[PDB]
Symmetry: C8
Subunit: 130 residues, 8 copies
Amino acid sequence: PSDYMPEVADDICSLLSSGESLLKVCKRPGMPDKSTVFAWLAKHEDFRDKYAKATEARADSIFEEIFEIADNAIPDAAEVAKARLRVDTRKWALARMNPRKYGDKVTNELVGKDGGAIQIETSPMSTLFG
Amino acid sequence: PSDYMPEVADDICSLLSSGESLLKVCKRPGMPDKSTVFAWLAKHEDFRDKYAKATEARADSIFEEIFEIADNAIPDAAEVAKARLRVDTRKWALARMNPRKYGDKVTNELVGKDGGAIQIETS
Amino acid sequence: PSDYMPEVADDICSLLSSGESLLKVCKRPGMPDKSTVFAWLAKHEDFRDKYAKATEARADSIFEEIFEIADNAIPDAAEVAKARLRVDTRKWALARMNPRKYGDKVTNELVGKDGGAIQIETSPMSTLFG
Amino acid sequence: PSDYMPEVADDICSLLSSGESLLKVCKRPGMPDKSTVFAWLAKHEDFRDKYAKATEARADSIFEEIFEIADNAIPDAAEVAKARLRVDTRKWALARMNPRKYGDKVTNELVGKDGGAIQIETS
Amino acid sequence: PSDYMPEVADDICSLLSSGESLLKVCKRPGMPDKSTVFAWLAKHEDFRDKYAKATEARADSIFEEIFEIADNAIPDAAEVAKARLRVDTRKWALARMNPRKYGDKVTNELVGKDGGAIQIETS
Amino acid sequence: PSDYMPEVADDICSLLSSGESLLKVCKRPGMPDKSTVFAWLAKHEDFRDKYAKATEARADSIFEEIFEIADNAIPDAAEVAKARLRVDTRKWALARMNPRKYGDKVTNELVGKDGGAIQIETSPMSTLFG
Amino acid sequence: PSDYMPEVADDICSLLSSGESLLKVCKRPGMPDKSTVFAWLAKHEDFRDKYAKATEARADSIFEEIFEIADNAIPDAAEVAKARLRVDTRKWALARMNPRKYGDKVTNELVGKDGGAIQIETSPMSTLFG
Amino acid sequence: PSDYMPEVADDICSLLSSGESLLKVCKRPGMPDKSTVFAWLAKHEDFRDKYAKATEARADSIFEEIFEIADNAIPDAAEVAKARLRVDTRKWALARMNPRKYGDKVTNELVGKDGGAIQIETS
């Protein structure tokens, strides 16, 4: 399939939503190749909008999946290394799929010299940087 | 079972709140599948909230789990590597489940050049 | 035991204070299961307050323990890897139990372009972000 | 083939935009070598732009590739190490190809001493 | 021995101040157990302070210890891994015992877009 | 060759531009040693300017090369470790050759206490830090 | 030796200045034990001042030493691991001995939303944080 | 040879400036030992400066060395580990020899809650 087919695009969104990766989806019977999916995306705003929603749902599904990949790892050195790689790749991807939810979280307690106030001295410009 | 139904959603929460993961909750008979749970959440703000607090309770349970996974690890190379992966995955997840509580903690002492005041020039 | 029992809650606080983990405490004779402890926490402010104090003390105990875990590690590859995991898990946990005391510590010397003053240029808003 | 020629440059872009890397594009018959592609870009701002969007499309393709590399890795020590290197290299590259999209994501909660207000003294 | 007693607390400090850890101090005859030492500290601000300076002295001793642990490590895989764990644990601990002295050190050169001035818009 | 030779300097710039390292270039027939190249740089602004341009081009070439080094790694433990080292060294170098293009990229969402506004309290100086 | 001896303290400063560690120095013939050195430090400002100077010099010596430890490492797995540990320990220590010289170095290019200006909105306090 | 002497110090600089390390420079006949070189620097500001530029030239040489160490590493486990240590040590050192040039490079896009403006309240 090369021509845009909304029924197929809808199915793609559903599968992605459930956690499946695009390349894996594109290997299913009657699915377009990844290049074609990207081509559809580029020219159909209805697909793009639903695909963005599916990406959010996809991330929520993957967040649950990482526990299973780790917990069910076959206790063999190479198998554990692969499980680790699969989990690390997902962790990285999740932060990009939904940065607000899955990005890193840090609380910075900001203090100044010797634990006192932050000391700031302002001066007029000394070079032409405007 | 696909139709959004309170009490059932209320059930799932109490389940997660007791430390149970979403997968296990959904593998129970009469329980909606993962996708259905998400669909619900997405279209109901009330469920989003109650689920959120269950998620914070789940985090508190996982926090204690990591000590046990580490301390009880089998002293075999692959098993220790697996335990480390299980712990690392939980640590990462906890920060997302309750960022204010389980996020990273840094104290930054901010000083200026040579430990003097921070020098700023403005236009 | 399912019903809240202050004598038992007090004992829990004492054991945690000494460095023992909750799941380990809950395996002792006559202790409630972890779910029950969390249930007690949720509905009894007297327990919650004493449990928070116990968590602070727990962290101070663990801070001493990490030296022992490392120093006494059996010099076998797997045993050292486990000791490392036990220590790393505690280090991570300590920062969350008492962020002010056990969080990361950084001193940032802040300077500007070419080691001079930090150069700032202010402008009126160019888009509607208010 | 060294002379800057639109349509050919337009071709390369569509090629990269479909996920193909620069090396492969340049190994095709009638295709300028790497150096020539760069020379072009450097002296033509129009090509720099179209190439930039092709680069963002290429990033989107690589983003999906990393899942497959990880999930389909052969369960052998050296092969898993190789797969990890392939993935790590792509992750690093993606942030440079589209920094706004694939860069690191952090939420910093900024507070002052003891969780009070941030204290500043100015001269 | 549970009753808070100066001179005994004064003793512990001088002990820690000479590089000795709390465990060893508490394993001595007539010495309060760990819990008792903490109880004391918690309810006495004077002890909290003297203990704090002993802790800074202890840090200075540990700082020199890490060189010896590294340099004298037995050239065997597991022993080197153990030495690395001993050193890493001490490095992490030192930053907490004296954050101003043993915390991380960074110099950040702050510049704006393209190395120009930092651009800010305010409402 | 010790005396500055523009034809040779031009060749050096071309080879570097294509991704080759300086020490490797300096092993080619009739090339000056690295010390000599640095000596030429120090005293000839025409060379320095063209060398800086070549460094930018060099980085763009290396950015493509890292994919090949990883993808074509011989699946042997030591060979993969070497490929990793070669890639890591290039990643580090690229950020210094063109910091704007190849430096790290972070988006920091800045918030204040409890996810509200960042709370700032200003006070008059309490010590003489001016 | 327990009593403070300036001649011995001077020697200590010289040895440290050259890169030697304190515990190693204290094993030399006729040297005080480390506890004694710290005791001397505590009560003699002349020693403390010269010891601080020696620490700066010590760091400069170690900075050169790390190259040698790495370059001369015996090509055996355990020996390389030990060399790495020796180098890593020194790197960490150097930043604390002279933070200005040997601390981490970062250049942060600060930009705002979508690569434009940093957008700041100020508001009156909404809670009592003063 | 302990007495501070220009031309000799000038010599050392040209030596370092050509990529040679301080150890090798000091192992040459008629060359002051390490300690003497430092003593000099400490008490002479002129030498501190000339040495500083030699140090920046030395950094530029080491920068090219790291490519060769990596690319020419012997494909044996311990040798690759050694090469990695040699490279890592040089990378770390370079940032200290010329921080503006070889320090870390980050671009931070600073935004506020939910990608809106950065919200500040002042007292």
